């Protein structure tokens, strides 16, 4: 059912905490989150984690079509915060029944409503409409209609409207913070199954934010909060890394579900989304040419371990709120250098996307070059380098990359390890792949078993 299994993290919001700067309440007044602890509690003297942030079986557990902005049928869940990430996996793979993620693509950003180059907007959004269509993998979007998370559903609007294909339909699950959303209402239908309807409007309750024009799902983590941004990272580093460490069920070799990252802009919090994930093992692509986070790290990612206590690139930033170096009033400047230098230190998790020939470096494959570099750090006599990567470049007709990425390694030459991704280059055509496996010299009599040709002739055209 998953109504009762997902629960809340919500609490009485007016009772205490004199944060009285808001002008429509004392501090987040009633006809609100005081629904069960509305009357006099025992003390209620602190709205701290001392105050238990209560749970209840879920309400926002249904379909919402847009009123006059979309037509497709999408499911959105209000969740808890500190639940184990396994019950929602039963919600997304059994209750939703979504096909297994072939790659996770975490798109992160800020609230900064940026507009990059339209040629950047071309090669980005023409790059994404092929990669998920060729795989059927899952895509992490972010919800809100201010920032990068406003631009990423425009790419989905290229797939949901222009290149409309349910065959290879993308899974762009946005993840919003319940409290920073623009509309509390239109979500409290006490049925557990609503085909409801409301309006996308960012200026609609404009002190808060509405969400992007096109995403597949919206997961709504509650804190008791109200507009206080920046709560996805306890879920983004946990929920996505949980469905990262799910191995595939079967198929060739049961490899783990990989994860790549995408950054377009963003600030503190976006920088604190990517650097811990690289320590967690998530590689990322960085768009040199557009970025507050996504520009200044790309200039220095090739440079070695040095320091400027950052003093030249500290205001080589975006549109310069708090204009210059001397009056930027965003402190911990020397403290921010380590949050770039550990990304500089971990060298296998980086691919810079420049402007000149990096769009000509095959953006359809240039995003996955990070995992062709990051999984090459694996060496444990255990092939998580050298079969999990080998199912990736075969899907792009990139033999020249595969000639460069593994054949120019210290390759253990492993003719048994060519054999499962031999068959990946046999279930579809892949001519120079099979020639490269013959240029490497796959011994065909020993590659062919009986169960090979059983599996082979099971995979006819």
């Amino acid at each position: 059912i998953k109504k009762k299994e997902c629960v809340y993290f919500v609490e009485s919001s007016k009772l205490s905490d004199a944060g009285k700067v808001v002008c429509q309440c004392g501090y987040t007044h009633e006809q609100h989150l005081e629904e069960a602890t509305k009357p006099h509690t025992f003390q209620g003297t602190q709205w701290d984690p001392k105050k238990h942030v209560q749970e209840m079986p879920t309400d926002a557990f249904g379909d919402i079509v847009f009123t006059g902005l979309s037509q497709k049928v999408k499911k959105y869940v209000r969740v808890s915060q500190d639940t184990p990430s396994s019950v929602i996996y039963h919600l997304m793979t059994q209750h939703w029944g979504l096909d297994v993620p072939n790659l996770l693509i975490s798109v992160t950003g800020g609230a900064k409503n940026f507009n990059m180059k339209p040629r950047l907007k071309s090669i980005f959004r023409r790059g994404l409409v092929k990669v998920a269509q060729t795989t059927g993998a899952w895509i992490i979007t972010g919800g809100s209609h201010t920032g990068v998370m406003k631009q990423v559903g425009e790419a989905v609007r290229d797939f949901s409207l222009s290149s409309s294909y349910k065959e290879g339909e993308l899974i762009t699950i946005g993840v919003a913070t319940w409290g920073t959303v623009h509309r509390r209402e239109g979500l409290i239908h006490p049925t557990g199954s609503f085909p409801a309807e409301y309006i996308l409007d960012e200026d609609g309750q404009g002190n808060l934010t509405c969400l992007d024009s096109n995403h597949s799902h919206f997961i709504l983590v509650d804190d008791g909060t109200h507009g206080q941004y920046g709560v996805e990272i306890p879920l983004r580093t946990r929920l996505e890394k949980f469905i990262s460490e799910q191995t595939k069920e079967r198929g060739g070799v049961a490899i783990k579900i990989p994860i790549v990252c995408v950054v377009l802009e963003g600030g503190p919090g976006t920088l604190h989304t990517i650097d811990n994930a690289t320590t967690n093992g998530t590689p990322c692509v960085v768009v040199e040419g557009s970025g507050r986070v996504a520009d200044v790290i790309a200039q220095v990612a090739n440079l070695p371990v040095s320091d400027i206590t950052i003093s030249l690139i500290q205001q080589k930033l975006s549109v310069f709120f708090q204009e210059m170096f001397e009056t930027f009033t965003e402190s911990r400047i020397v403290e921010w250098t380590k949050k770039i230098q550990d990304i500089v230190r971990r060298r296998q998790l980086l691919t810079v996307f420049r402007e000149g020939k990096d769009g000509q470096q095959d953006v359809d494959v240039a995003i996955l070059q990070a995992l062709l570099k990051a999984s090459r750090s694996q060496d444990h006599f255990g092939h998580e380098n050298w079969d999990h990567q080998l199912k990736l470049a075969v899907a792009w007709n990139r033999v020249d990359i595969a000639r460069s990425e593994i054949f120019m390694d210290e390759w253990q030459w492993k003719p048994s390890d060519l054999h499962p991704t031999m068959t990946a280059a046999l279930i579809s055509n892949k001519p120079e792949f099979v020639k490269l496996f013959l240029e490497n010299g796959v011994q065909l009599k020993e590659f062919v078993t009986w169960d090979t040709l059983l599996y082979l002739y099971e995979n006819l055209d």
């Binding site: 403290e335 949050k339 750090s377 255990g382």
Partner: protein, 269 residues
């Protein structure tokens, strides 16, 4: 010198995920400069802030008990030189991490460990080395922690009331074997110095003494029957010998000290 806290500066700790003072790579030691800004000092994670009834370390205002001396019920003594108690809290030589006065390491600075480095140069079906390049092939009994996704080497880290390898006797002997007590007696010492434990703060930091029992002979190795006994029946989940390469599930752990083992014995690592 910037490699003091590359694991300790992590954000998520599965016991207590507190990190809210990063300290830069140019400003790692507190002795030269860390910053003028400070973290709070409260983790304590289990029992008490500084009383710590099962782990009798010291309080803070009941001042520390003179780190050089044999103080009582707990020796926090070091192979390091500067065990600097400055403000009633033992600031490390490795610089303030920006963490919050950890006593959850059960010592307020457990500054000694010893892992069961059972050195056996591996061989093929009849006897060879790493023909990988030129070097040797090394295999070491490591024990998988049953819930965490890594294997582990039990630290000889001084169980309270007991001596050094008696915290290695958290599991060395519970797999029922009361016989052989001459482990480092047939052992060859390897390395003394710091290890960047991920739960290290200014007031708590861990280092090692490393001893090798080199089984280059490969015939009278210590085994389930020969010279030792490890059943893995009641307290051992997976205790398998493991070959040296730079990914194996010892990730930000014991693996980061076996490169000195490969430099000692000529192993491929």
């Amino acid at each position: 010198g910037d490699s003091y806290h590359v694991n300790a500066r992590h954000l998520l700790y599965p016991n207590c995920p507190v990190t809210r003072f990063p300290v830069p790579n140019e400003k790692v030691p507190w002795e030269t400069e860390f910053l003028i800004y400070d973290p709070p000092f409260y983790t304590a994670e289990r029992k008490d802030a500084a009383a710590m009834d099962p782990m009798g370390d010291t309080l803070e205002p009941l001042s520390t008990i003179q780190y050089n001396v044999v103080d009582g019920l707990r020796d926090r003594r070091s192979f390091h030189g500067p065990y600097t108690v400055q403000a009633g809290l033992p600031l490390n030589p490795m610089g303030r991490t920006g963490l919050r006065g950890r006593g959850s390491l059960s010592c307020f600075g457990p500054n000694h460990t010893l892992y069961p480095m059972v050195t056996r140069w591996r061989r093929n079906e009849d006897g060879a080395i790493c023909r990988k390049s030129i070097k040797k092939m090394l295999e070491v009994l490591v024990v998988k922690l049953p819930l965490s996704e890594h294997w582990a080497l039990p630290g000889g880290s001084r169980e309270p009331g007991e001596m050094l390898p008696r915290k290695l006797k958290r599991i060395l002997r519970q797999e029922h074997w009361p016989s052989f007590e001459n482990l480092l007696k047939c052992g060859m010492e390897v390395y003394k110095g710091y290890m960047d434990d991920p739960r290290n703060t200014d007031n708590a930091w861990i280092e090692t003494v490393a001893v090798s029992v080199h089984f280059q002979d490969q015939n009278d190795v210590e085994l389930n029957r020969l010279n030792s006994n490890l059943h893995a029946c009641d307290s051992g989940a997976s205790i398998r010998w493991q070959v040296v390469d730079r990914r194996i599930p010892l990730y930000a752990n014991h693996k980061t000290l076996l490169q000195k083992a490969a430099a000692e014995f000529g192993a491929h690592y």
